């Protein structure tokens, strides 16, 4: 059902925004969907939005933007209805896409990516209103949703997708914020992953 929704929004979209997490963008990249888009539908414009940049140091966000710009146009973003970052840049980029496709009478911008990257949060940021439901729990969005940004620009909200793989272990999937933690068996087996991924000083400051 989720992948049916994904292919529906891709078939309906002119611009596709792939949303990455600023903490682990390579972890949150959907390379198979990118390759499908570049092979079968080359006329659809795929760009990167690096969300949650407020959770990383500024130089980390700058370096990730620089390295991802060697492949795709990448925009740093912080999604918030009241105090955001990058909203004007995203809006002017969308207006440029509309101007390029000024004979289409409207364009659609579909937001795809991993669960909990903040697709609904970015759409709410662009609309300056809570129009898509947002929750910290993954899978809050289930079906697609059309949002009218301007008269000629539609945004399409899509549920998060996790492409299947064999190298992606359960620990990697859990630490990408994909699964609901209340439904896992033994989280003490994953706590050493937290210890390896976090600084000792940061942990000791957080938990005293």
């Amino acid at each position: 059902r989720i992948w049916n929704e994904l292919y529906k929004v891709i078939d309906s979209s002119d611009v596709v925004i792939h949303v990455l997490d600023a903490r682990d963008p390579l972890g949150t990249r959907c390379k198979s969907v990118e390759e499908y888009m570049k092979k079968e539908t080359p006329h659809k414009h795929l760009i990167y939005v690096l969300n949650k940049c407020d959770l990383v140091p500024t130089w980390v966000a700058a370096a990730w933007v620089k390295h991802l710009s060697k492949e795709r146009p990448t925009l740093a973003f912080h999604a918030s209805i009241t105090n955001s970052f990058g909203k004007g840049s995203l809006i002017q980029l969308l207006r440029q896409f509309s101007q390029l496709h000024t004979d289409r009478k409207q364009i659609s911008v579909g937001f795809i990516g991993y669960p909990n990257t903040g697709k609904s949060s970015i759409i709410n940021t662009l609309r300056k209103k809570k129009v898509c439901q947002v929750a910290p729990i993954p899978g809050e969005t289930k079906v697609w949703q059309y949002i009218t940004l301007m008269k000629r620009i539609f945004l399409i909200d899509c549920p998060g997708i996790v492409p299947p793989s064999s190298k992606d272990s359960e620990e990697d999937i859990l630490f990408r914020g994909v699964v609901r933690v209340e439904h896992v068996t033994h989280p003490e087996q994953y706590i050493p992953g937290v210890l390896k991924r976090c600084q000792v000083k940061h942990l000791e400051r957080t938990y005293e």
Binding site: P42, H43, H45, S69, K70, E71, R72, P73, L100, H101
Partner: protein, 133 residues
């Protein structure tokens, strides 16, 4: 309110006008908005079909193809010079990350995608020796 009447608005700005056309809607707008209520079949008191539902007509068409020499000629050809130009161009292209594809050109890409390969595919050994042998 003589100035707010439908006639006076037509003066300020015969049989071609449709129902619903007013200060807010013209004829094309009216018919496009009636699309959302269009798809209904109309029947009379006795059950006769006054008008079939849109895109649901039941009349069998007479599907024929007339003889015409336009069917047997070539539709697309390409010269050797154009082929060589596109073959040389495919390889000179430096893709920029900030350029998007607006419209792909229609070309004989099977004739144009010819890259020199350093190795040959393996020979078909079944041509010389079968399983039974």
């Amino acid at each position: 309110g003589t100035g707010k009447k439908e006639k006076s608005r037509r003066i300020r700005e015969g049989n071609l006008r449709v129902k619903g056309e007013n200060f807010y809607r013209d004829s094309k707008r009216v018919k496009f908005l009636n699309m959302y209520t269009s798809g209904k079949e109309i029947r009379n008191k006795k059950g006769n079909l006054i008008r079939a539902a849109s895109f649901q007509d039941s009349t069998i068409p007479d599907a024929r193809v007339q003889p015409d020499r336009r069917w047997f000629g070539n539709t697309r050809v390409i010269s050797q010079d154009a082929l060589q130009h596109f073959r040389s161009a495919l390889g000179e292209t430096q893709k920029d990350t900030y350029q998007v594809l607006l419209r792909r050109n229609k070309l004989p890409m099977s004739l144009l995608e010819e890259k020199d390969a350093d190795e040959s595919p393996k020979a078909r050994i079944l041509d010389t020796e079968s399983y039974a042998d």
